[PDB]
Design a protein around this nucleic acid. Structure first.
Lengths: 65, 32, 115, 155
RNA sequence: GGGAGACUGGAAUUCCUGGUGUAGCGGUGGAAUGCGCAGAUAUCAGGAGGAACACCGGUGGCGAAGGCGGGUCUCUGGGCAGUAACUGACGCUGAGGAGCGAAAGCGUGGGGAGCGAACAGGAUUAGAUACCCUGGUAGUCCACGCCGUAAACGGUGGGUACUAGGUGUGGGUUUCCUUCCUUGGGAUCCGUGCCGUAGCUAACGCAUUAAGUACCCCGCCUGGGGAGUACGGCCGCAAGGCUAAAACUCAAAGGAAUUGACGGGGGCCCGCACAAGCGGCGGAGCAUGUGGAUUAAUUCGAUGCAACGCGAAGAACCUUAC
C-alpha cells in the first residue's frame, strides 16, 4: 500500500502486449499478485488483471508454471 | 424468536403433506 | 538395462504411497508401493511404510544401473520428506526437488462432505 | 517438574583418587545401600586394569575417559506422531549408563564366575572401548546417523 | 461480476487407444463390499466430451428484489458528478390489477465429465429403512413453455425535513505548498462499514444508512391449540398455490435478561499426571481375601476409582451370629 505507480500522471499504459510490465505484477507462477502487496489501486488492478488474462490467452505468458 | 414454535408448526405441515400423498388417488376419484 | 539418469515419481495420499522410478522419457523400470512392502490396512499411510517403499523401489532401480534421479512429488501424504530421505539413504544421489500436484481452476464438483 | 530443579547431591571428589568422574560411577553402579561392597568392587574392578594391563589406575582413568565417549545421541518426542528422533546434548551420565547396563551388572551372563575378577574383567573391557558394552553406544551411533538429517527441529 | 446473443482459452476429473511396467489398488476409527492378477494402480504420448471458471477476490462493485465474476465482439438498461441551458408543481403513495421472481418440480426435444434424492450391497449397532464405504437412476446442463413459492431476513413498507461527533473504505468535483506524483492536507455531493452523545426501548440494543423528533399514503396484528385445516371458489398438465372459517379444548402460550446446574464446548494453571531415572506386579511355589461353585451348613455384610491381608487388633472349644 505504498502507492500506485500506474496511477501516476507519471505512469505507464497497461497493454496486453507489453509482457514486461506485467511480469512485475504476476508471481513466479502466473498468480496475479494481490493489491494489498502490489499496492495498486482498485481501478488499475482491474486493468493488470484483464491484461495478464488476455496475454496468457495469446500465449505471451505462462498459464501458470 | 425460539425454534420450538417453528418445529411445532413444522410437524403439522409435515403430517398434512403425508396425508395428501396417501389419499392422492382417492381424492381424484371423489373429485369427479 | 543400463540408464544412469532417471526420474522418481512419488505419489503420497492419505491412504498409501506409490514410488516408481522412470527413464527421462517416462517408462517405468522399477516400482514399489507400501502395500508391496508388506503393510496392509491403515498402516500404508504411516511414515514407516513410505520409508520402506522408497528403500525397496530404489534398490530395484540400482539393479538397473540408475545413478542419479530427479524427484517429482505429488499428494498431501505425510510420507513425502520421509520418501525423499529414504532415497538419499539408499544412495541414489537425488537431483532437484520439484512439486507437481494437480490443482484445478474450479473444474469438476468435489464429492459430498463427510460428517 | 513445573519450575526447575536443582542438583541435590554433590559430585564429591574421590578420597583416594581425587576425581568426581569416578565418583559419578561408584554411585551410578550401586546396590541396596551397599557403598561398603561398592567400595570393594569399584577399586577391585579397576584393580585388574591396574595389573592385568599393567598401567596404573590413573591411566585407567585416562583410557576409559576417551575410549567410551558416545557423548551425543538422539531422543524421541511426539513429533511426527511417531518415533521421530532429534539429537540432544547430554551430560556423560547417560553415556556411562549406556555401557553400565551391559557392564559388570550384566557381565554375569558370560561364563565368568569367580566373582569380581569378572567385574574387573568388564571394567577392563570398559577401558578397552572395543568390548561388549560399547555395542549399544555403537547401536545408538548408527541409530543417530540413521536419522542423520532429522535434527532440523533441534530441541 | 447490470442484462441478452455469438464466437473462443486453458488447468483438472472421466473414458478410449498405444508404450514402460508387476501384484496389488481403493477405503476407513478399524474393515469388508469393489476393482485387478485376461495385465489394475502408477507412469508417458495422442484423442473424445461435458460442466464449472484457481490467482485477481475482500467485510470491495453493480442491480428494485431474486441475483451477477475465463477472454473478445455486437446490442442495451440504470447511477453519480459538474454547468444551470430548458418546461414550470408536471410531486408522493398506491385498494383491486400487471410484470419480474433462488432452489426444487412438470412438458416436448437435445445433452450427460463430475456430483448424485430413490435403489442395491459392505460395515457399525440390541436393531439400522441413517450417519461411514463401494456402485447408481431421475436431476444438475441447453432451447421453448409452465410452476410462483423460501430463515424470498436488516425477521425493520415508500417519500420528505431536522437532530454531537470520531475513524475506515468505493465513485465525481474543487481552495492552501508544490515537488508540481499523489493515501500532502482543506471543503462539498453520492454510496458502504465500525465506534459513540441527545433521544427511544421491557431488555437486548438502535443511534444522521434510527428502532430519535414530526407530516402524507399503503399492508398487517387483537391469547395458545384446532389450522393457514375443512367447505365453496379462482389458478395449475400435475405437485400444489391464493382467499379462508366453525364446533371443541386449554389458563396459558410467549419476548428479554439474572443466578445455579449440565455438555461426548473452549482457554489457562496445579498434583510422581506424563516425559528423565530406579525398583516391582503380570511368568513359578506358598500365604491371605474375594467370585464361581458343591454341599448339611459352607453365617451376615463389603462390590469402581472410594470392596477384596476390608468389619478380624487372633474361628481346634468359646468365639459364632450357621
Amino acid at each position: 500500500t505504498r502507492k500506485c505507480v500506474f496511477c501516476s500522471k507519471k505512469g505507464q499504459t497497461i497493454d496486453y502486449k507489453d509482457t514486461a510490465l506485467l511480469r512485475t505484477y504476476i508471481s513466479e507462477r502466473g498468480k496475479i499478485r494481490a493489491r494489498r502487496v502490489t499496492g495498486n489501486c482498485v481501478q488499475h488492478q482491474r486493468d493488470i488483471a484483464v491484461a495478464v488474462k488476455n496475454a496468457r490467452e495469446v500465449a505471451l505468458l505462462p498459464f501458470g508454471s | 424468536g425460539s425454534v420450538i414454535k417453528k418445529r411445532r408448526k413444522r410437524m403439522s405441515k409435515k403430517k398434512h403433506r403425508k396425508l395428501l400423498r396417501r389419499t392422492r388417488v382417492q381424492r381424484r376419484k371423489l373429485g369427479k | 538395462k543400463n540408464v544412469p539418469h532417471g526420474a522418481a515419481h512419488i505419489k503420497s495420499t492419505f491412504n498409501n504411497t506409490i514410488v516408481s522410478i522412470t527413464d527421462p522419457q517416462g517408462n517405468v523400470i522399477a516400482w514399489a508401493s507400501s502395500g508391496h512392502v508388506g503393510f496392509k490396512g491403515s498402516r500404508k499411510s504411516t511414515p514407516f511404510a513410505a520409508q520402506l517403499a522408497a528403500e525397496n523401489a530404489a534398490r530395484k532401480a540400482q539393479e538397473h544401473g540408475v545413478k542419479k534421479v530427479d524427484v517429482f512429488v505429488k499428494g498431501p501424504g505425510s510420507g513425502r520428506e520421509t520418501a525423499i530421505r529414504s532415497l538419499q539413504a539408499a544412495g541414489l544421489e537425488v537431483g532437484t526437488i520439484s512439486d507437481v500436484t494437480p490443482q484445478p481452476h474450479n473444474g469438476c464438483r468435489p464429492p459430498k462432505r463427510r460428517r | 517438574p513445573r519450575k526447575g530443579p536443582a542438583p541435590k547431591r554433590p559430585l564429591v571428589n574421590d578420597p583416594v583418587y581425587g576425581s568426581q568422574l569416578v565418583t559419578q560411577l561408584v554411585n551410578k553402579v550401586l546396590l541396596e545401600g551397599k557403598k561398603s561392597l561398592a567400595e570393594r568392587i569399584v577399586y577391585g574392578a579397576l584393580e585388574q586394569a591396574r595389573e592385568k594391563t599393567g598401567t596404573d589406575p590413573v591411566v585407567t582413568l585416562k583410557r576409559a575417559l576417551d575410549n567410551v565417549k558416545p557423548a551425543l545421541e538422539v531422543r524421541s518426542r511426539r513429533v511426527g506422531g511417531a518415533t521421530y528422533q532429534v539429537p540432544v546434548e547430554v551430560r556423560p551420565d547417560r553415556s556411562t549408563t549406556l555401557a553400565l547396563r551391559w557392564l559388570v551388572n550384566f557381565s554375569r551372563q558370560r561364563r565368568e564366575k569367580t566373582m569380581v575378577e569378572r567385574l574387573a574383567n568388564e571394567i577392563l573391557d570398559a577401558s578397552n572401548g572395543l568390548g561388549a558394552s560399547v555395542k549399544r553406544r555403537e547401536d545408538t551411533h548408527k541409530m543417530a546417523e540413521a536419522n542423520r538429517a532429522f535434527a532440523h527441529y533441534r530441541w
